[PDB]
Design a protein around this ligand. Structure first.
Ligand SMILES: Nc1ncnc2c1ncn2[C@@H]1O[C@H](COP(=O)(O)OP(=O)(O)OP(=O)(O)O)[C@@H](O)[C@H]1O
Ligand SMILES: Nc1ncnc2c1ncn2[C@@H]1O[C@H](COP(=O)(O)OP(=O)(O)OP(=O)(O)O)[C@@H](O)[C@H]1O
Ligand SMILES: [Mg+2]
Ligand SMILES: [Mg+2]
Lengths: 49, 292, 146, 49, 49, 49
């Protein structure tokens, strides 16, 4: 019941400054970082994350 | 009533209006009656039997065995005088005339809106007997885009909420639904479906006998010096609408001002028809050299 | 048609006919239809409402509808006044059937325009003066005098 | 129903939402029956076959 | 399930095909099922070669 | 109160229990009690406040 919330978004574009802009399904656009298990080789623009 | 920081029911709130519902009635009865509308002549009786008659006595309709209308469409050309028939009904039914535009149930965000379609019918039921006229259904009877997505869900929902409610608050008169449309061959069946509405009154630009009466009622108020015959004019302006007949009356009297006169005459009218009718579906001028 | 009942309503009153409710202008573009409209604005001096039919209709449905309620509602309080809407084909143009995304919104706007003019409502003394670029690109409803 | 300070599910709400009829008119179990039509007796017997 | 012949067909088509697909879909979902298909003289007609 | 932060709300309807339903321009309608800093005669559906 206490399970944490993670926002859903789709990748907008992959930046070359090691961050990705993922546009939420809330509305806004965010520049988000990344985890050390997840990489930009596994992401493509229009990848759900 | 809910609380802001906790959201618990503490009270009940009695709704009957919001600003939009307030502008929809009452005008304490218009200036148009069946006195002020000319003949059609048979379609006057029909519209009366469809609304007014079961209204006073759903007991007599049930008793017999017959289903009253589930909704009323008026369909026909513009300017034959339809929203004009709706004000007349309003004066003699004495039953609260709701005037609402079908454009206003489809709004920018969602259940402004959809909530509003169910709101008009809740009002209807407590105000009963009533008498809801909605008005040119072209945005509540629209076909589905599949999809426009912001636009389309609104038009689709609101379409369904109209039809399902009338079906269900009317086995017998209680709330009568009345309405009208300009066009319906532009859109798919929803109100042209016979499992929802079932009474579509054809209201057409007027018969010979109808034309004369309309000229008579308009001229009633006009100052005249008698040599006029309405019947001859009526023949010339065959195939014209009730509003064309009004447009000629208003020009004949302006014409009189140009002549320095305030009495209208047959000459004044015939000129007045020529101007108008010529900017309109046409006037003949040759029958060949092989026919008379 | 316009200057005369606005400035002296008595004379139409004496005959028993109604004042004019408007003027439709059509024909070849560039003959000075909107020019003429600016010409009467300088001599009426009775509050000239300037809108354009492509400034009606906005990004969500029913905001357009809202705009058409909003010009007429204002106009009834200032009346007499001139509402000159530049295109009526930009808010109501002939179709075979709608095809539907952009096309439907057009009849939605049309419903709102009818209604107020003298559809049902009191018109006061407006006097909605129209224009169209091309002869026939309107609907019969607008075409129809009254 | 979500416990909205974690936005995790705490309860499935019965009814589970009222469906929206499409492909109208749909009449699940029609009220018009073959006794409610006469005079096309032989057409009934064929459409049944 | 009734689809009328009035909805069917447009001046150019694609939406007309979707609603055949729509009633086929409902019929599978809501079995046993009788799909009423009128008015087959305005959506079926003579082939041209 | 006469100072900002202030918010325009437009009256939805007026209740005789001693409350007013105001439709806020933010979104939500709410019920708030009357005061002797207003008249409800002056209030009407569509009254700015
Ligand atoms: N039979 C009649 N008696 C009196 N006035 C008439 C008659 N028919 C039409 N009119 C006149 O026509 C004009 C009213 O047209 P109205 O707007 O009521 O049309 P409608 O047929 O409901 O049209 P739309 O299709 O545009 O919604 C007024 O000038 C009205 O006086
Ligand atoms: N009678 C005239 N004398 C001189 N110039 C004029 C006259 N009539 C129109 N013009 C000029 O013609 C040009 C276009 O006319 P205007 O913009 O008034 O036209 P319109 O017929 O309403 O057009 P649209 O179809 O583009 O809306 C303007 O530069 C205008 O001043
Ligand atoms: Mg009408
Ligand atoms: Mg122009």
């Amino acid at each position: 019941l206490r399970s944490p919330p993670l926002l859903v978004g789709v990748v907008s574009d992959i930046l070359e400054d090691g961050r990705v802009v993922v546009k939420s399904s809330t509305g806004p656009k965010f520049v988000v970082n990344t985890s050390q298990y997840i990489n930009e080789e596994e992401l493509k623009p229009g990848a759900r994350v | 009533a809910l609380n802001q920081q906790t959201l618990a029911i503490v009270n009940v709130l009695p709704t009957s209006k919001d600003p939009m519902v307030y502008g929809f009635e009452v005008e304490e009865k218009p200036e148009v009656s069946y006195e002020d509308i000319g003949g059609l002549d048979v379609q006057i009786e029909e519209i009366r039997e469809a609304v007014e008659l079961p209204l006073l006595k759903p007991e007599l309709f049930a008793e017999v065995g017959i289903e009253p209308p589930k909704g009323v469409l008026l369909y026909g050309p513009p300017g034959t005088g339809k929203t004009l028939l709706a004000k007349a009904v309003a004066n003699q039914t004495r039953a609260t005339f709701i005037r609402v535009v079908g454009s206003e149930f489809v709004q920018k965000y969602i259940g402004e809106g959809a909530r509003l379609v169910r709101e008009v019918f809740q009002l209807a039921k407590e105000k009963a007997p009533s008498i809801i006229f909605i008005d040119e259904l072209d945005a509540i009877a629209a076909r589905r885009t599949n999809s426009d997505t912001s636009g389309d869900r609104e038009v689709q929902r609101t379409m369904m909420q109209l039809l399902a409610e009338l079906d269900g608050f009317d086995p017998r008169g209680d709330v009568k639904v009345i309405g009208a449309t300009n066009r319906i061959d532009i859109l798919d069946p929803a109100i042209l479906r016979p499992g929802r509405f079932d009474r579509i009154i054809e209201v057409p630009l007027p018969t010979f006998e109808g034309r004369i009466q309309i000229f008579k009622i308009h001229t009633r108020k006009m100052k005249l010096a008698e040599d006029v015959d309405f019947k001859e004019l009526a023949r010339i302006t065959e195939g014209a609408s009730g509003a064309d007949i009004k447009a000629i009356c208003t020009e004949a009297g302006m014409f009189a001002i140009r002549e320095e006169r305030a009495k209208v005459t047959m000459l004044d009218f015939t000129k007045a028809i020529e101007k108008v009718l010529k900017k309109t579906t046409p006037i003949p001028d040759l029958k060949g050299v092989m026919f008379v």
